[PDB]
RNA sequence: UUGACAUUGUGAAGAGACAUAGAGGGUGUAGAAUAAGUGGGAGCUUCGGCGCCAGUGAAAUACCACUACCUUUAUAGUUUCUUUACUUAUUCAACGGAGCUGGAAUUCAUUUUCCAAAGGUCCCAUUCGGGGCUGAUCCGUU
RNA sequence: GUUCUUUGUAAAGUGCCUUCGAAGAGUCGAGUUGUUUGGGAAUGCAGCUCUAAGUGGGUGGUAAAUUCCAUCUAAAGCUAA
RNA sequence: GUUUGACCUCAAAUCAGGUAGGAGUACCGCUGAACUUAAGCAUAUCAAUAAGCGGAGGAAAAGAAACCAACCGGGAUUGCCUUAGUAACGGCGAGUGAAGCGGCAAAAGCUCAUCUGGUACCUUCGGUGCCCGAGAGGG
């Protein structure tokens, strides 16, 4: 339920998640980076945690972020969807908090996570940014014309009883 | 066409919009040279003193020809002929009374002002009548004709509380034009009584004859 | 500032909407749950951190619920017994804050701990909700860290009853300077001069 | 709401810039809240009324949070 | 006892107004009538109309802004009040829809209501003994 | 007074260069109801209601334009004598 | 339609480890009288007294300025001194009653927004060995 003034909803069938989730484990796992030096080039950076993620977007280093849908309190994640669009940084929204923690190879859940610098996977990653705009290309008309609910069986029948009503009775 | 060039919401600065300056040169469509004019909404009151009346001297003319008739007595008639179209005696009031009114405006002496009084019924309606208020009587009559011909312009508050006068021709250059509006505003802004309330210059607008108007800050 | 500033911002607001939905739904949970609610997380991270909240052993965040209104005084029905100046049931108000009563209640239940801290976080109508930081003195984790170390010393015990807490200082009228102020050094300190 | 007009985003920016000028002016004799009303009320009342009504209520919401943070930042730099 | 405010949501309109855009008219002496009150002003268009001219007067009646007031429209509003409808926050007290088949009724028909542990299979066993499912029912605290 | 012994690194002074956040919201402030105070339109605190900005802000003993003066950054904390 | 292993939120148990409740005379935080005074009395006074309750320590409590200010300077906080029966309150009746400063006692400025537990090892306020859960910038 709720009333409500607009929050959050939308897109994650599992397929689109799953490709992004394997590409995040490979975002960490790709690691060399590498045993000599002082200066010494990367492959991988993965940073977890809501604070690290927000900073790296503002720094414009992040190639692609993930946010969990399942975040509660809601107001932790809230900044990033808008913020990253300003920056032109793509975001995916995974269904569960727990899932996001496992792929980033954390012990615990992750609210948000980032890939900052990928490794040799230019084409597939670009392919997922595009798939991510294919699911929510959107700009922001945010969104509840009020929703909340799903009606209840007795009210739903009342809806039907009211449609009959307009047709001959009222 | 003319409307698109102007922006109603925008309030421009004196140089950017013509007002008197560049853009309205484009605005004034007509075949003949139009005058550009200045308009104020003045917060001012019904009281006489709180009215705004005085005469500014435009640096650069209205560039219209104005034919004077001026009636004077003594060495002052002689003085008149130097910078005046039609020198008039105290006798001449009977001619203007009969029918002749071939003159734009009239200027008179203090001496003359007794004789003047007869003229007022005919003059007062067009507001041609001389008054200290619109500086048309002064014994330094010679200097003052020089000013009106140069193009000293007249300012009268309405009962409506708008104040208005023509500033120049649209055709005159932008640089020239800007100087005249400036003097005029400066002259307005001083005349302003203390007794008047908040923002003496409520609104400022200029237009051409035909065209749309743009507002100035 | 960095994450927190957004969260903190949302708090400023609260008729206002993204916070406002969260909280309206949280009101429902709040009415069901007890006077004592220990919680893992600050529904406040922004306010909590400045709060010196650091995640580290012995630290708890706890939510407390205190009634809203004026004061009611005993003994009704058998009304005193004094001149009209004395007289007051509803007329009088607590001098102490609702925040301060919430701290004393929390500390009372959790005898083991000492309150660092009080932050206010939902208004509904009948109830006022305060989320309290209580800090373990006794263990070595809190102790080994210098920033926290002060809480532990025996003088601080029962700081909330004593009025030493930030709110307690505030309700003395203490802040912090001169005229406003003078008899805030203590109440009893003027000592009937 | 959509359009106004004329101008758009530039007009939205004026409406918001004007509202700040009303709100500071509204602060500067204190209250604010009744004064937000009085400062608007002692003025023409059209464009101004609509901005004030929102400002009280909901009150853009997400967009304020957005704009303020950009301003904070760019006074940060 | 009684009204207001917080608690605090939904939207039907009846009635009141406030953006611009397009209309109309604008009740002081005389004046055919439309001189309300402002800048301006010698033309805008042509089969023309108004100034031109009538005629009076303080001032005359083209035309591009303007704008007090009577009134009324569009675009896409929004605003109070009701009431009056509606539930989702909320409070207090302490089942719903489908499925058979039965029976009543409509509609030519489509359509639309009213009502009311045994044995089977499987899995160990393949041996007694056991367990799972089925055993009229599928879906989603009052 | 005597005696043991690690690398260092980074901090810090002095001087050049731009620059600037860790700086705290139902708070600041308001009304209407209290009680307290020497506190008087001007003490402090409670309650109900409402409610900012973000280098902007607060103070300077009533309230309102300005430049600026003069001072200081709340809503956090500790602390010897 | 249906279950099983795993992720995190709430709950209950359990034993371990760690601490509190109570107390000592007064000192030391809130709620809160009256007779009494004004030759009555109702604001005021008694009095922010006594009491009651909560609770800490060897002192407690307060602290480095969103201070002071009425100038031009001071520069954390107590106390002492005196400011002063001044300002201010008040049937402006009775009464009530400061502060800034000046200078003393004594002085001090900082600090926020890998940790722990387990077992082993020792010279056991420690550290090593492992395992487990969680004021700022450039050269």
Place of tokens 């104005």: B66
Q: Which uninterrupted H or E stretch holds A114? A: strand A112-115
Q: What's the CA C193/C1' G96 distance, rounded, in angstroms? A: 12
- Three-class DSSP category at B57: strand
- From chain A, the residues in CB contact with C26 under 8 A are 73
CATH architecture group of domain D1-77:
Orthogonal Bundle (1.10)
Structure tokens at A94: 């995974």
Distance of CA A24 to the CA centre of its chain: 13
Q: What's the CA C179/C1' G75 distance, rounded, in angstroms? A: 17
Nearest 5°: the CA angle A59, A65, A68 is: 130
Contact partners for chain C, using 3 or more CB pairs closer than 8 A, are A, D
**Sequence-ordered list of residues with C-beta below 8 angstroms from that of C124, at least 6 positions apart, any chain:** C27, C30, C31
Please measure the distance between the N-terminal and C-terminal CA atoms of chain D and give it in whole angstroms.
34
Q: Do D11 and B9 touch (CB under 8 A)?
A: yes
Residue among A55, A73, A74 minimizing CB distance to C2: A55
- From chain C, the residues in CB contact with A54 under 8 A are 2-3
Pick A1-153's CATH classification: 3.40.1440.10, 3.10.180.10, 3.40.50.150, 3.30.1330.30. Answer: 3.30.1330.30
Q: Do C21 and A73 touch (CB under 8 A)?
A: no
Q: Do C5 and D69 touch (CB under 8 A)?
A: yes
Alpha helices, DSSP H only, in chain D?
9-27, 33-41, 47-57, 62-73
DSSP-assigned letters across all residues of C63-126:
EEEEE-S----S-SSS--SS-TTT--SSS---SS-HHHHHHHHHHHH--SSEEEEEE-----SS
Neighbours of C2 (CB within 10 A): 12
- From chain C, the residues in CB contact with D61 under 8 A are 13, 16-18
DSSP summary character for residue D16: H
Q: Do D58 and A5 touch (CB under 8 A)?
A: yes
Q: How far apart are CA A119 and CA C93, in angstroms?
A: 67
User: How do beta strands B86-88 and B68-71 pair?
Assistant: parallel
Q: What's the CA C153/C1' G37 distance, rounded, in angstroms? A: 49
Q: How far apart are CA B154 and CA B148, in angstroms?
A: 9
CB B210 within 8 A of CB B6: no
Domains: count for chain C = 1
φ/ψ of residue A31, rounded to 5 = -35, 105
Q: Do D62 and A82 touch (CB under 8 A)?
A: yes
- Region of residue A147 (phi > 0: left; psi between -120 and 50: alpha; otherwise: beta): beta
Q: Do A75 and C17 touch (CB under 8 A)?
A: no
A29 touches chain D (CB under 8 A): no
Structure tokens at C179: 């005229």
Work out the minimum CA distance from C93 to partner chain D, whole angstroms: 25
Work out the minimum CA distance from D23 to partner chain A, whole angstroms: 25
Q: How far apart are CA A156 and CA A138, in angstroms?
A: 31
Q: Do D69 and C15 touch (CB under 8 A)?
A: no
Find the CATH number of the domain harbouring C122.
3.40.1120.10
For chains B and D, count residue pairs whose Cβ atoms are closer than 8 Å.
7
Please measure the distance between the N-terminal and C-terminal CA atoms of chain B and give it in whole angstroms.
24
- From chain B, the residues in CB contact with D14 under 8 A are 9
Place of tokens 């994450």: C3
Question: Is the peptide bond preceding residue D5 cis, with omega within 30 degrees of 0?
Answer: yes
Sheet with A64-68: strands ordered across: A46-48, A112-115, A64-68, A91-94
Which residue of chain A comes nearest to D73, CA vs CA?
A58
Q: Which uninterrupted H or E stretch holds A62? A: none
A9 touches chain C (CB under 8 A): no
CB B89 within 8 A of CB B128: no
D38 touches chain B (CB under 8 A): no
Domain span holding position C10: 2-193
Give strand letter and number of the nucleotide nearest C149 (CA to C1'): F78
3-state SS, B116-155, equals HHHHHHHHHCCCCCCCCCCCCECCCHHHHHHHHHHCECCE
Place of tokens 């709040």: C30
Which residue of chain D comes nearest to B8, CA vs CA?
D6
Residue D54: closest CA among D28, D19, D21, D30:
D19
- From chain D, the residues in CB contact with A5 under 8 A are 58, 61
DSSP summary character for residue B14: T
- From chain A, the residues in CB contact with C7 under 8 A are 75-76
Q: Where are the domains of chain A?
A: 1-153
D7 touches chain B (CB under 8 A): yes
Q: Where are the domains of chain D?
A: 1-77
CB B151 within 8 A of CB B18: no
Structure tokens at C159: 């700081």
Distance of CA B37 to the CA centre of its chain: 10
Nearest 5°: the CA angle D15, D19, D23 is: 175
């Amino acid at each position: 339920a709720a009333e409500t003034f607009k929050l959050f909803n939308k897109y994650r069938p599992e397929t689109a998640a799953e490709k992004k989730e394997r590409l995040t484990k490979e975002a960490a796992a790709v690691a060399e980076g590498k045993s000599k030096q002082d200066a010494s080039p990367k492959p991988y950076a993965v940073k977890y945690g809501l604070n690290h993620v927000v900073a790296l977007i503002e720094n414009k280093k992040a190639k692609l972020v993930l946010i969990a849908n399942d975040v509660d309190p809601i107001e932790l994640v809230v900044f990033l969807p808008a913020l990253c669009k300003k920056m032109g940084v793509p975001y995916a929204i995974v269904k569960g908090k727990a899932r996001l923690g496992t792929l980033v190879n954390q012990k615990t859940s992750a609210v948000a996570a980032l890939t900052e610098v990928r490794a040799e996977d230019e084409a597939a990653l670009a392919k997922l940014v595009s798939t991510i705009d294919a699911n929510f290309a959107d700009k922001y008309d945010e969104v509840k014309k009020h929703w909340g609910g799903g009606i209840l069986g007795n009210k739903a029948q009342a809806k039907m009883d009211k449609r009959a009503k307009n047709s001959d009775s009222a | 066409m003319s409307k698109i060039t102007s922006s109603q919401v925008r309030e421009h600065v004196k140089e950017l919009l013509k007002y008197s300056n560049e853009t309205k040169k484009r605005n004034f469509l007509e075949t003949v040279e139009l005058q550009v004019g200045l308009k104020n909404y003045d917060p001012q009151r019904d009281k006489r003193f709180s009215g705004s009346l005085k005469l500014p001297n435009c640096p650069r003319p209205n560039m219209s020809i104005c034919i004077f008739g001026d009636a004077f007595d003594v060495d002052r008639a002689k003085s008149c002929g130097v910078d005046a179209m039609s020198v008039d005696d105290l006798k001449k009031l009977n001619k203007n009374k009969k029918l002749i009114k071939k003159l734009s405006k009239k200027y008179n002496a203090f001496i003359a002002s007794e004789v003047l009084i007869k003229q007022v019924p005919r003059l007062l309606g067009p507001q041609l009548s001389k008054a200290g208020k619109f500086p048309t009587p002064v014994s330094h009559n010679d200097d003052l004709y020089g000013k009106v011909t140069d193009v000293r312009s007249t300012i009268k508050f309405q009962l409506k509380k708008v104040l208005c006068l023509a500033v120049a021709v649209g055709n005159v250059e932008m640089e020239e034009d800007v100087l005249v509006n400036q003097i005029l505003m400066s002259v307005n802004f001083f005349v302003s009584l203390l007794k008047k309330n908040w923002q003496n210059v409520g609104s400022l607008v200029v237009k051409s004859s035909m065209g749309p108007a743009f507002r100035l800050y | 500032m960095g994450a927190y500033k957004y969260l903190e911002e949302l708090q400023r607001k609260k008729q206002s909407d993204v916070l406002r939905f969260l909280q309206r739904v949280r009101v429902w949970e709040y009415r069901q749950k007890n006077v004592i609610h220990r919680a893992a997380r600050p529904t406040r991270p922004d306010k909590a951190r400045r709060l010196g909240y650091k995640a580290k052993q012995g630290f708890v965040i706890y939510r407390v619920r205190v009634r809203r209104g004026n004061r009611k005084r005993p003994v009704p029905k058998g009304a005193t017994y004094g001149k009209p100046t004395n007289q007051g049931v509803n007329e009088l108000k607590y001098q102490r804050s609702l925040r301060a009563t919430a701290e004393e209640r929390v500390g009372r239940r959790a005898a083991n701990l000492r309150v660092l801290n009080s932050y206010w976080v939902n208004q509904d109508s009948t109830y006022k909700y305060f989320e309290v930081i209580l800090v373990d003195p006794q263990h070595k984790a809190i102790r080994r860290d210098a920033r926290y170390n002060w809480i532990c010393d025996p003088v601080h015990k029962h700081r909330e009853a004593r009025g030493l807490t930030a709110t307690g200082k505030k309700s003395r009228g203490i802040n912090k300077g001169h005229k406003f102020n003078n008899t805030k050094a203590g109440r009893r300190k003027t000592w009937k001069r | 709401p959509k359009i106004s007009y004329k101008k758009g985003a530039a007009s939205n920016r004026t409406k918001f810039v004007r509202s700040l000028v009303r709100e500071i002016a509204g602060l500067s004799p204190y209250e604010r809240r009744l004064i937000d009303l009085i400062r608007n009320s002692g003025e023409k009342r059209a464009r101004k009324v609509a901005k004030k009504r929102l400002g009280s209520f909901t009150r853009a919401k997400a967009k304020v949070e957005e704009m303020n943070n950009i301003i904070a930042a760019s006074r940060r730099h």
